[PDB]
Amino acid sequence: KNARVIELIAAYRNRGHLMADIDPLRLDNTRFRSTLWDLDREFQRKKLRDILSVLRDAYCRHVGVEYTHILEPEQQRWIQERVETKHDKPTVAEQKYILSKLNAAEAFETFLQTKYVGQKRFSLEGAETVIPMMDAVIDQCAEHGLDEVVIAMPHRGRLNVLANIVGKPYSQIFSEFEDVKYHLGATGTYIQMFGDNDIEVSLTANPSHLEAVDPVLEGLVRAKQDLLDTGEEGSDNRFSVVPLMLHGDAAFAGQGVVAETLNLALLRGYRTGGTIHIVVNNQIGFTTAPTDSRSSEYCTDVAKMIGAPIFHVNGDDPEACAWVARLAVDFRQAFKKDVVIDMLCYRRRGHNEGDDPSMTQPYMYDVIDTKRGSRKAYTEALIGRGDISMKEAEDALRDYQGQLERVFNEVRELEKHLATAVDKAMLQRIGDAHLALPEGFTVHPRVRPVLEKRREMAYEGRIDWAFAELLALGSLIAEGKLVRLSGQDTQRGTFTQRHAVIVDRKTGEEFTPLQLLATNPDGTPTGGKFLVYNSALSEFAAVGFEYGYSVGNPDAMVLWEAQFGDFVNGAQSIIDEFISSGEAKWGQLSDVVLLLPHGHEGQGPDHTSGRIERFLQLWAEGSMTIAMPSTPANYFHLLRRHGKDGIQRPLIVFTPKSMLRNKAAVSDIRDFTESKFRSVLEEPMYTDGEGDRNKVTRLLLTSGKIYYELAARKAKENREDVAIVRIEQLAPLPRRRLAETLDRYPNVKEKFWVQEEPANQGAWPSFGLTLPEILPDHFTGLKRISRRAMSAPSSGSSKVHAVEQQEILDTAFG
Template structure:
């Protein structure tokens, strides 16, 4: 396959017997599964020799037999796709093996794989005494030292919300990163020094000695099983080719590649050693090599013959792969009927009662007891605020048997002191989680305060959600502004994994958003960036305006098929806004409405302007309209920004055929929903022009001065009504 990239393992071949030893030990120890996350270097070799992918499948991918008119996705290069298979040890024991799909963004798969493993372990529910799913992460030397997500993921390893019982890290140490020498790529002596932060043992081993690599692999596995902690193998080797097969490394590393050109391969060195020891004869070695080459030639010829035969297009980006079980389940369930999201009033009461039923002797903080009593009252009397509306969504799902996992910075209490999912005894420090104590038979409820990270923390929850289609999985930013610390996860996994790899996720991102005078870093979740990535129904983007709307949205997400990620821009000041509270009936009837039209009180003939908006700004507009006694202005809310329900918007504005249409937002003109709305909505409005009221275009999301913010906010609200 002349000119094709394969990112060969030549020079580092010993990693295959090393991995074989780890998986063989795992099979003998009766582990349920070994999950591997790795970059492109040597991936095809691992697919064939460890994950059980046939040579024919690999050859077919190089032939490019995938239908270019594929309707199920655009696909990805062959060394990025994931698979699942069975590994059989030489002695006959077996274990499942999972190879995670990954992008070219080095080390990005690390937290994702850990999330996948934790989800598998939670599903098996064997407890912390036996972590029966083993994560194996493979790295390059330059990436292990250079990519910050490596340190973030190592920091996850012993945390209660993230631990997986220890990861075996294998570094293919080529002593070069693309064209960059170690002296230019790290300040530490060893590329592995970052792992010393968690006191992980580090084994340095010669890649030219396969038997030493196998011994180290067994030792590393034993350490992991004994101590449930990470362990690192630094296999020092070289890269015979360039970064890829079309690259000439002698241009930048001439001395190194003079040595490599003169060096005999690992296979030749080991064969000579075996013959010298008398373990095999020259004839044995030649026969083994000849048999293997004949096997490859035979499969290659069969592949070429099959390629000459017209293929039936599958339209599937993952054709020929044994998909991971979770992906198979997601594909099988994608046409399931939607579930009702309204619940019985008794469900709300049960959740409320649980909040005023602490364990015997538990001393609730005096500031929190009134809040718990208020929640119990809300369950029957209404005036439900945002924090409790979300709790009701979680509680109702748990009572239906759906498990929930949520993590984020300060998520147990809530950044804005709104959630209080876990309460702490004022005297003893013991914890009580009301949602975990609703009924004998209920879903599991896990909520964790995450490490101070976005990249690894979001990646972990994405991986968890991929593997747990039966659970609602949420990641919450402390402020939506900080979500961009995980931009790689959003770009490479959340927005595009289904299109590239056929890998579905229903992870929920909760991004607090709202302009309230807190400055440029505490105002914007960057709605415009998420909407820019929207296409082909890849994700759902919402900005609910009431607790009940948020409730129905979360419940819809838990059961929605096909599974898609959900991005919710959640409020801050609106959390306790009395006018935004919801009645009990809003939870026991109806469902999530993508668009909320103007109520019946306004006469169509009187209305000469319709304001379209989303989120908190609705309540500012409503307050201004009430203050003015305005009966000429209607307000329509878009609770869901993508997929854009243009038909519902049209229905809402058609009631006022003579009115001017105006989009109103708090964000600057070049940010927020407007760039997306301006591009996508007008074509559905029957030729009616759509005007805009917003802050002026700005390089920064928001003003640093609270006085300037207040003036800007007053101005845009006034512009919305002034004729």
Template sequence: MSSPTNTTASSGDDFGTNSWLVEEMYERYRDNPAAVSEQWREFFSDYKPGDVPKDAPVAPTNGTGASRGATTAAASSGTRGVDDTFPMRRPANIVPTQEVVAPAPAALTAPSEPEPIRGVGAAIATNMERSLAVPTATSVRQIPAKLLEVNRRVINGYRSRTGQTKVSFTHLIGYAVVRAIVDAVPNMKNVFVADADGKPQLQRHTNVNIGLAVDVDKGGGQRTLVVPVLKGADTLDFLGFVNAYDDIIRKVRTNKLTVDDFQGANVSLTNPGTIGTNQSVPRLMVGQGVIVGVGSIDYPAEFEGSDERALNQLGVSKVVTVTSTYDHRIIQGAESGLFLKAIHDLLLGEHGFYEGIFRSLGVPYEAVKWRVDSNDLEGADLQAHKQMQVATLIRVHRVRGHLIADLDPLRWKTPRMPRELDPLTYGLTIWDLDREFATGGVGGVQRSTLGALLGVLRDAYCRTIGVEYMHIQNTDEQRWMQQQVEGHADNFTPEPMVILERLNAAEAFERFLATKYVGTKRFGLEGAESAIPILDAILNAAADNALDGAVVGMAHRGRLNVLANVVGKSLEHLFGEFEGHVDPHAVQGSGDVKYHLGASGKFQARSGALLPIELASNPSHLETVDPIVLGTVRAMQDQIEPAGAFSVLPLLVHGDAAFAGQGVVAECLAMSDTSGYRVGGTIHLVINNQIGFTTSPEYAHSSQYCTDVAKSVGAPIFHVNGDDPEACVRVAKLAFAYRQTFHKDVVIDMVCYRRHGHNEGDDPSYTQPLMYKAIAERRSVRKLYLESLVKRGTVTVEDAERILADYQAKLQSALDETRAQARATTKVPPPPKPVGVLPHVNTGVERGVLDRVFAAMNRYPDGFTVHPKLLRQFEGRSAMYENEGEVDWATAEALAFGSLVLEGSPVRLAGEDCRRGTFSQRHAVLVDYTNETKYAPLANLGTGAAKFWVYDSLLSEYAAMGFEYGYAHANPAALVMWEAQFGDFV
């Protein structure tokens, strides 16, 4: 049996529509080989111009040649082109006026003599002639474009806000074409070939290699067509398809297409709709199975003169006409029809088409869904009902809009649309988006289309800022907030260079310490650098408002960065603490850690105004500093006249787990508006890195947010995405304005991440492998913001890097000066001798019991993937136990727990991060490295064993310890333990 004829690299036949371009490149190569790229030179080394079959068929006339001749003759005979079958009659009552004499016609120029078509034109003509040998048929389908338009608007709104390029209709339709072939009618990618004897054969293709017809303006009124090929389109998700498509178009525009870019198409896509063509039946080139033509997106012609508002009321959609011109030798009409139906279904959102696109692009919202319209034009009751539903939708966005806000920089959880925020819940569909409704003044207008109204509401509550304020009882405060965020009464104008400079300083400081003091604990701010622009914006506003001072309280996370970049602590002094230059006679002595020390200074606003600022020393235990700061501020305010001016600003920085877990936070909120403790409102900044040491949010608090405790006193809460520094600065200014207007507490919940472990030596991937995989792939907020500013044209990369280099040079100079100083020596007293307090008790068990427990510790469920680093540790543990008969502390503890469980005594262990262990030593619960499923070996000791429970508690001591005491009292048979994490947490 003969095999299909192969096309060699030296033949122009494989290029189809692009053959003219090959001829043109060859002419350039022949004149000057250096004028083309090395790849083209290699291609032309054995190229034979005009290498096409000499017996290529020409178009059959079917009598049309005679018809054309007859038409030409008639047109040149001077006969008037008027149909006189029904002669026109002149009305009798019309009085003839003066005869209008038409101007004499201009002299006609005879056409030129026929001339040969050469070069590019000849190649195109040959291709078109050859295409006539392909017996084609065409299927046509008109598809509603409403959902396509709406989802594209959502996609491009998001991409515009994040500084990305727009997605075109051709991107979306082209991807639908590919998916329709792959998932519905794979035969569309096959092609007809003939073997050496001319016998017909079918060639099946695994991949969809789609040729993209691109119109090229050659200047001088000349246009031409190139069809580069996007290979393996079926292997790409939507983002990959868009990137590959755009890369090809970029090559076309910059004239950088290579030989390979023109070869291998088995499907083609042409979109003459971009120039207004409604429908196209393009030519199918030899070597392809189908070419898809896409028309313009517009209302059907019969509605072209209609009022668009009337069309919106009627629910008339714009449409796009898609044609499938296919090789009828291998593809049947039914298959072509099913292919177009598949495209139709996809563009109407079937089979999760738009959901997959949103997921691929990282759009943090659910895709809009297709629904049939319901709009009785004569039914007043229905219109009134819809109006009421719109009012409900407005209120629900004010109350619950934050639930769909784009708050998580990692976006590692699938976005969900709560029913109460979905317009479909209220009977409002995509058809209502262009219909007008009363708004009640939202956005400063009384009437608006539903689409515009939703735009205002979602810009206010559902972008990278989510606001909770409808729990506030005071309606004046509610209205104030609505005016600020819905109508942009705050008139926020970002200062990009200021923000970039602050981010530069924040990131450079952490990178500098990480480089110069490798492995040293510093509890860095990486992942939460936007906290520095937030604090800067608040203090800048406080200075411009002539406040008398600010007192800041915070724990260890980011404290050194705040000292250096906000409070203005001397860099030499700070580096001296890393070098060991500590004054032993200072109040705190020589033993306190550098990330607990305080400082005071003067903050200078950009206007030149100065604000005294103090960062209180941290009393080691989380959130203990909060009431100390409030007491300090009240004392300062009581010494300032007039009383009640609240001219000293308290500013507290919290961790997410501590804000929810530490009872002292709730106590401070409870005292915030009482006469003896009032300070005129505290601004709380929660650095929400979505983890507490190793404890995930679902174990750290029972509420939706870590900040829900603040609702108890009616404090507004601004949730903001930490990777949007402009949004962070905006909420900082709004929070300060609210505090100054109402003298109440206000909370900023900055959702971010922690790039490293709890400290720089900790590995968090033992317990959160998926989160830290996402973090490892995430670029820093400074780089992301710089990229967006470069795209906007606000700054160049060179300028930004120069600013960064200047700050790094400042740090290096301070370090050099510090290291030039002599280090003070201190004498540390020896530790006291240990004293025993309990008599010896024999607690030993049989070796067989220990072996059974140890075997269970090294047994995992089928398909469970242990963390690679942990697996190596366990292998070392096994070698030590089996060969040397020795165990470390953590293994001894596990053996003791296991032996008790086998003896029938239940064991319950709870505390902060105790499943893994504070020092990564216990690993009582293992986390699958690939999917984060959990497994506790000691809870699976087999038949007859008692229960073993181990829990990460919320970040609480007093309540958590009391709970375990109550549990132990009610279950004396169990060993109940509460682990004090660092020993000082009691």
């Protein structure tokens, strides 16, 4: 009999949530419907009736608890102890405060729908309990003495969140009203009602693309945590900046970026010490029922992927919603792990103006039409429970009216009225750092010559691309800059060229040579730091995270590296919605760098192109910098200009693969110490040699590694009649430098744009249209030499590639 009791306790803990009264609409009519002598027997000693009452109150009332899937026994025990105890009833003051938050939320929803037209799609009606729930999250974070709560959410209830959570005044919110305000960033200060603490509250910008902002929030919070010296890269483990992420039920289950972002939660390179997730589960997605939106019992089932506790709560019970919000913050503080709150509610009205929701959901909306809002329900429950008197409920209705009056009145009143060159000692210091190994450190025999060659390059020149990148990042760290670099296998490098982190052959201990540059020769810190990580196998979440990280710390140097540029299309939503367009749409600035390994080498259509043409198509004056450098020193100056220009603009770099090891693609020490970024490059025979520019009758304009192949062919046939000009900066077009360079070749009779990429790809679709328009005296008659237009970035065969590469070389010199 005592074995049956242990099985009964486990059944309530494991599956009690399936019986919990969580749906305020009670749509599922079969949810609840599908010995007595032992009830008074004792089984710590407790009677079976007392065990069953504790289990029912904890697991089968307005809170459905999912936690037995958690592999950590200490986390399961922590939830058990706090959920399976008699809870102290909230004070009348706390209850009145919860009611006053529901009064503010409904008074805001009432004014919006009444004052303006076309506001229905933004309505939080049937879900107003999310306002005292969010208030409880922020208040509990303030109680923990934390510094900031950063929110990401979709558009539903956003302005209500602006007024009743962020604390933005109505005059600012509805200043020259109308849609753009449902996507803008905001900041405020939350002051505790019953406490003496305060906390910063911010709301990040987002597109309409639901859940796309999720990794952006995490990056943004991580950047703020690194700046506050809290968390993973901090001295304290408080993670004093809390991500609060809101979601819709259909989007949370359907968008892949949710899983990608959850997968980052405990990674050393991406953890934020746990996110508080709130799903506004109104059991609908426009006209779509949950049975067409997901293959699981709950919209939050994806969170089981990382063993996050999940709390399903009845949105018509704001006390249970506030209690669960505070429990979620406490769990996050104790275990530094994500918590999901599934708030079951409803969408009172139609999705938008042209929607009578009974057309597609007659049953749900016949039930919704018999519902009285959370505010009225809570006022009626408190009255029935004897917690408040008739005068107190009447005073609360007076508070609702005064709050509705205030917003109508306040809005009425508003209606009435730089050098990048470094010294040689800097290069030598970065070279020496590669050999300044910790005591007893064992280097892998294949990594040892790379280190020794870097010391040699630092003092003797012939600096290759891989070392020039580290010279640029190392010199920024020495100057006090925080440098964050990440991507797939970025510590070692996809092409075994980087070795930013080296691994002890016997212990596996990591050593980061560039980190030595964060300390000045005298021993004082520079203020700089090198944060280098291997990312998860994600593009969408990883690019979103790095974009968010550059927003969170505008003073950081933030670089994301694609394994091959070909895989960045997995992050297209981030490129389209944030990187290329965030500045013009929201005034949100990012200095994020995308490194895209690019080049035709015969490795197939998915190991060849970063789709230059797509980034050039997205570009519009002053949105991004787009470059394809051909020399290590020009890449070094490109990165240093980007980190020191004081301008927050994304940089897109088309980086090499085989050209990393091309012996002609090396730079002299003077190119680092006495030069700057060159947007346009001429052949060294004309700038440093005995070449005669006046013999040139044919000019080849190009970008990237094909220059070396064109230069080798010119050298082989002694073609003095042909010159090769490189466009290093593809966007913005270096109009003046390009015009001044071409004027130095007066006998040119024909000009060709030469590229490896197909005719419908690379720089030709934009340069072929733009160059004759911006420089008509220089580029009227410009012709293209390239691969034929293709539906894929290249052929699948390395043999076909080699024939096509040779046809480009023969056409340019034909």
